[PDB]
Design an enzyme around this catalytic site. Sequence first.
Site, PDB file in Angstrom:
ATOM      1  CG  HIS B  71      -0.402   0.555   2.620  1.00  0.00           C
ATOM      2  ND1 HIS B  71       0.091  -0.497   3.527  1.00  0.00           N
ATOM      3  CD2 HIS B  71      -0.183   1.607   2.947  1.00  0.00           C
ATOM      4  CE1 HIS B  71       0.424   0.320   4.582  1.00  0.00           C
ATOM      5  NE2 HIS B  71       0.555   1.534   4.182  1.00  0.00           N
ATOM      6  CG  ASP B 127      -0.081  -3.693   2.813  1.00  0.00           C
ATOM      7  OD1 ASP B 127       0.149  -3.428   1.920  1.00  0.00           O
ATOM      8  OD2 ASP B 127      -0.216  -2.953   3.896  1.00  0.00           O
ATOM      9  CB  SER B 226       2.926   2.916   5.811  1.00  0.00           C
ATOM     10  OG  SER B 226       1.493   3.023   5.942  1.00  0.00           O
TER      11      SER B 226
HETATM   12  N1  LIG Z   1      -3.331   1.884  14.718  1.00  0.00           N
HETATM   13  C1  LIG Z   1      -2.645   1.800  13.586  1.00  0.00           C
HETATM   14  N2  LIG Z   1      -1.305   1.445  13.542  1.00  0.00           N
HETATM   15  C2  LIG Z   1      -0.911   1.729  12.168  1.00  0.00           C
HETATM   16  C3  LIG Z   1      -1.879   2.510  11.554  1.00  0.00           C
HETATM   17  C4  LIG Z   1      -1.543   2.839  10.394  1.00  0.00           C
HETATM   18  C5  LIG Z   1      -2.203   4.386  10.362  1.00  0.00           C
HETATM   19  C6  LIG Z   1      -2.245   5.018   8.773  1.00  0.00           C
HETATM   20  C7  LIG Z   1      -1.499   4.028   7.948  1.00  0.00           C
HETATM   21  N3  LIG Z   1      -2.263   2.918   7.510  1.00  0.00           N
HETATM   22  C8  LIG Z   1      -3.114   3.237   6.140  1.00  0.00           C
HETATM   23  O1  LIG Z   1      -3.048   4.536   5.389  1.00  0.00           O
HETATM   24  C9  LIG Z   1      -3.756   1.897   5.329  1.00  0.00           C
HETATM   25  C10 LIG Z   1      -3.445   1.877   3.850  1.00  0.00           C
HETATM   26  C11 LIG Z   1      -4.404   2.009   3.069  1.00  0.00           C
HETATM   27  C12 LIG Z   1      -6.012   2.408   3.173  1.00  0.00           C
HETATM   28  N4  LIG Z   1      -6.126   2.706   4.708  1.00  0.00           N
HETATM   29  C13 LIG Z   1      -7.278   2.938   5.267  1.00  0.00           C
HETATM   30  O2  LIG Z   1      -8.413   3.572   4.722  1.00  0.00           O
HETATM   31  N5  LIG Z   1      -7.228   3.025   6.789  1.00  0.00           N
HETATM   32  C14 LIG Z   1      -8.278   3.022   7.685  1.00  0.00           C
HETATM   33  C15 LIG Z   1      -9.326   2.776   7.195  1.00  0.00           C
HETATM   34  S1  LIG Z   1      -9.855   1.144   7.736  1.00  0.00           S
HETATM   35  O3  LIG Z   1      -8.950   0.588   8.773  1.00  0.00           O
HETATM   36  O4  LIG Z   1     -11.270   0.786   7.801  1.00  0.00           O
HETATM   37  C16 LIG Z   1      -9.251   0.125   6.179  1.00  0.00           C
HETATM   38  C17 LIG Z   1      -8.633  -1.133   6.376  1.00  0.00           C
HETATM   39  C18 LIG Z   1      -7.918  -1.803   5.368  1.00  0.00           C
HETATM   40  C19 LIG Z   1      -8.059  -1.201   3.952  1.00  0.00           C
HETATM   41  C20 LIG Z   1      -8.865  -0.029   3.913  1.00  0.00           C
HETATM   42  C21 LIG Z   1      -9.678   0.535   4.771  1.00  0.00           C
HETATM   43  C22 LIG Z   1      -5.983   2.218   6.829  1.00  0.00           C
HETATM   44  O5  LIG Z   1      -5.449   1.776   7.954  1.00  0.00           O
HETATM   45  N6  LIG Z   1      -5.260   2.259   5.766  1.00  0.00           N
HETATM   46  C23 LIG Z   1      -0.063   3.567   8.589  1.00  0.00           C
HETATM   47  C24 LIG Z   1      -0.510   2.541   9.867  1.00  0.00           C
HETATM   48  N7  LIG Z   1      -2.964   2.463  12.592  1.00  0.00           N
END
Ligand SMILES: Nc1ncc([C@H]2CC[C@H](NC(=O)[C@@H]3C=CCn4c(=O)n(CCS(=O)(=O)c5ccccc5)c(=O)n43)CC2)[nH]1
Lengths: 10, 278
Positions: B71, B127, B226
Amino acid sequence: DFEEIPEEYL
Amino acid sequence: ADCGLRPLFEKKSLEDKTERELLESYIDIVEGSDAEIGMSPWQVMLFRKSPQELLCGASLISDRWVLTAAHCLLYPPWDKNFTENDLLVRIGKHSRTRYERNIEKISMLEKIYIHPRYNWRENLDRDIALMKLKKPVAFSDYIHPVCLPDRETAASLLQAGYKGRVTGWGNLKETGQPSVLQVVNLPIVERPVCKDSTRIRITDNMFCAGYKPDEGKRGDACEGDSGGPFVMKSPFNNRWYQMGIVSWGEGCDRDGKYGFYTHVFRLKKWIQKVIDQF
Ligand SMILES: Nc1ncc([C@H]2CC[C@H](NC(=O)[C@@H]3C=CCn4c(=O)n(CCS(=O)(=O)c5ccccc5)c(=O)n43)CC2)[nH]1
Ligand code: NA
Ligand code: NA
């Protein structure tokens, strides 16, 4: 926010 | 071969300031602390050429391969789709923004390999991605690969309550940016608890980590972290192993929420396969 990097890296 | 033995600690028989905490859990970044120099020699920075910005963390697994979250390169719902000429890999860094002359080594990518079954449409299942460097990086005191788990390492360390370590230059709060690489030790959480904390569908290619709202300790990966490594130190051979890749989480360090990591051992077959297929 970043210090420039050696031009040759680009 | 030499994987997971840090030149500045294991090699000279020196302990970092929090490893005892890991080892003590094996039954003997938000809210992290600054990492010590050469504490995470495998930590890699995914750098954007233009504009010049940190994309993600990553890890050195050999002198020519970097492991990161898929991602980090591809996420079509956000029009994210990086090419090898789009990024730079920065190895041996401590400071987040400054060019660490004579310490860090910046590399160019030869090829990006995304898991063919990376599920970006739903839950970021599988991922993971490999990036092969245009040229092998030379190891040093600040640059050294981490080990990839084998079936029996994965088996004995990947247990609820056992702590791993996450590193990154990511946000300091959901809503701060470090100047220096941060660390946090977090416990692996029982899978049912992981499942019960989200609406998203958790697959076997995943594990979650973080403290319980009750445990009274905090910490989490955050934006910019990430693709970074979740590692553990084997108490059997003293090596550092990468068990996880920072994947996804809802917010950073929210009560009753956990970070989710790509289960490196489950995907090790794909890793080997592309490594000696190319
Ligand atoms: N607590 C914690 N530790 C590390 C983190 C993470 C915080 C932010 C980053 N992660 C992201 O940007 C990823 C990647 C692509 C899409 N995306 C989402 O829409 N969600 C959030 C929406 S979701 O969770 O509903 C979702 C999950 C999987 C795919 C799409 C959406 C999500 O978590 N992601 C890096 C670690 N958080
Ligand atoms: Na659920
Ligand atoms: Na949490």
